[PDB]
Design a protein around this ligand. Structure first.
Ligand code: HEM
Ligand code: YIC
Length: 454
């Protein structure tokens, strides 16, 4: 049994000031590069261990030994996402109840029903870019966020954010973004009770009220109209858990909708932004993906079956998730006393953090060339060792949105590659901004139309 490395300390604050940065994931990645597959991290009243190797993470992903933990970040997000799926413990009644009711709404089969709505938003993006003048550029993560927010709004609850009609966000999104910022900002605070944070606290309660008031209204309005539109809100108002025989209540429905709007704004847009980043930095790869898009997408409007045929586009998206998993960490706790990797003894309740970008850089799995962008790593799914590739987390607490995110992203990237050539006109230097998620800040391109009608 070995003694675990630990990064540099700050007296009574232990390791906490290491999170005093706007790029804490990138900081934890550097520490893992220096210390290796496991390190201890201590704050006043808190210990966790950061895992980076497939060897240890495959053990952490054993659901008989470890369950999902709410990290401090998830506990602060729970002040507005409540006992929605993402911020509930596995043992809370509302977790399994919502999971049973919603799984069918998120299946690959259910994507056939969402396809038309996703095409509506995708075509708005392509039209935007077609309509730019020769001297203008594309603000990539800004546009991808407009698309992914609007898609979840229309598939989630038949609501149009109309993000392509606006520079300034919807009132709901102003409060959601500012609540998410406060939740992440509170991680690093040594003295959170200091009156310097009274205004932050006041503003946070106001933003929770805005989100609650606006979603509660959408739900009340739907119940009144009796309208049976094919969206997540209808499924949640009509669904019954086969286990309990119970439907979700209106409060839990509101938490699910806030949770989906977080995910729709934060995660899929990062994936699309990194994918386009890697393609413009790897023009041989962009040509392979552009050739597939041109060959497969033969109709003005892509069909569900055509999106399923975009294999190489799917490989580009998986290789973007390998290098920059846009939801880059999850947390586990030990169900019982156990020994991790024959070396590290854990007590019941001990917590683990999985650093997904480091897992995805494990040379024992991927080979020496782990920094190269090579979609061919994913030519064959079954060749990927179990628990090597975890951009959607683990087991029964894995992302319910995975099929949705990949269908949207494959559709969008396919249409972008059909309709435009791209130029990295500024020779962009990757700058990764961290919120809940990772995005390439300031990433801009020029698009030259191939002038193919919709
Ligand atoms: C609209 C798109 C998406 C929706 C609606 C969505 C929704 C969710 C929900 C509800 C959960 C909690 C599932 C549960 O525990 O029962 C979850 C977990 C997760 N999602 Fe997503 N998601 C989306 C996109 C993505 C994307 C694109 C990624 C990564 C690139 C991602 C990564 C994850 C991860 C890593 C977890 C596990 C979190 C943990 O263990 O703490 N999600 N998602
Ligand atoms: O939130 C936590 O408990 C710890 C940070 C922490 C460690 C020790 C003391 C206080 C905070 N979080 C993390 O290590 C990670 C990596 C750095 C940024 C914050 N982290 C997060 O998990 C943020 C939650 C996100 C939800 C989807 C993807 C991740």
């Amino acid at each position: 049994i070995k003694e675990m490395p630990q990064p540099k300390t700050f007296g009574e604050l232990k390791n906490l000031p290491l999170l005093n940065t706007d790029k804490p994931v990138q900081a934890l990645m550097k520490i893992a590069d220096e210390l290796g597959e496991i390190f201890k991290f201590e704050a006043p009243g808190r210990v966790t261990r950061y895992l980076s190797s497939q060897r240890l993470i495959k053990e952490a992903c054993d659901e008989s030994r470890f369950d999902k933990n709410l990290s401090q970040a998830l506990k602060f997000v729970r002040d507005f996402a409540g006992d929605g799926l993402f911020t509930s413990w596995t043992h809370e009644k509302n977790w399994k109840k919502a999971h049973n009711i919603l799984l069918p709404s998120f299946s690959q089969q259910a994507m056939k029903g969402y396809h038309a709505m996703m095409v509506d938003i995708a075509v708005q993006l392509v039209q935007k870019w077609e309509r730019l003048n020769a001297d203008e550029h594309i603000e990539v993560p800004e546009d991808m966020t407009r698309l992914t927010l609007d898609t979840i709004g229309l598939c989630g609850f038949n609501y149009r954010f109309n993000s392509f009609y606006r520079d300034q966000p919807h009132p709901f999104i102003t409060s959601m973004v500012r609540a998410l910022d406060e939740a992440m900002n509170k991680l690093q605070r040594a003295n959170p009770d200091d009156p310097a944070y009274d205004e932050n606290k006041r503003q946070f309660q106001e933003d929770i009220k805005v989100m609650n008031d606006l979603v509660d209204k959408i739900i009340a309005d739907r119940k009144a109209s009796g309208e049976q539109s094919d969206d997540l809100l209808t499924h949640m108002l009509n669904g019954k858990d086969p286990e309990t025989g119970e439907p979700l209540d209106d409060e839990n429905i509101r938490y699910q909708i806030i949770t989906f709007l977080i995910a729709g704004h934060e995660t899929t847009s990062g994936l699309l932004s990194f994918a386009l980043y890697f393609l413009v930095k790897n023009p041989h790869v962009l040509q392979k993906a552009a050739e597939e898009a041109a060959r497969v997408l033969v109709d003005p409007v892509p069909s569900y079956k055509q999106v399923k045929q975009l294999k190489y586009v799917g490989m580009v998206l998986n290789e973007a998730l390998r290098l920059w998993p846009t939801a880059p960490a999850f947390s586990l706790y030990a169900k019982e006393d156990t020994v991790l990797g024959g070396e590290y003894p854990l007590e019941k309740g001990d917590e683990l953090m999985v650093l997904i970008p480091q897992l995805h850089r494990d040379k024992t799995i991927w080979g020496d060339d782990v920094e190269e962008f090579r979609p061919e790593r994913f030519e064959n799914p079954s060749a990927i060792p179990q628990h090597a590739f975890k951009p959607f987390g683990n087991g029964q607490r894995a992302c319910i949105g995975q099929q949705f995110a990949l269908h949207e992203a494959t559709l969008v990237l396919g249409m972008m590659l059909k309709h435009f050539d791209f130029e990295d006109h500024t020779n962009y230097e990757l700058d990764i901004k961290e919120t809940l998620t990772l995005k390439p800040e300031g990433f801009v391109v020029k698009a030259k139309s191939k002038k193919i009608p919709l």
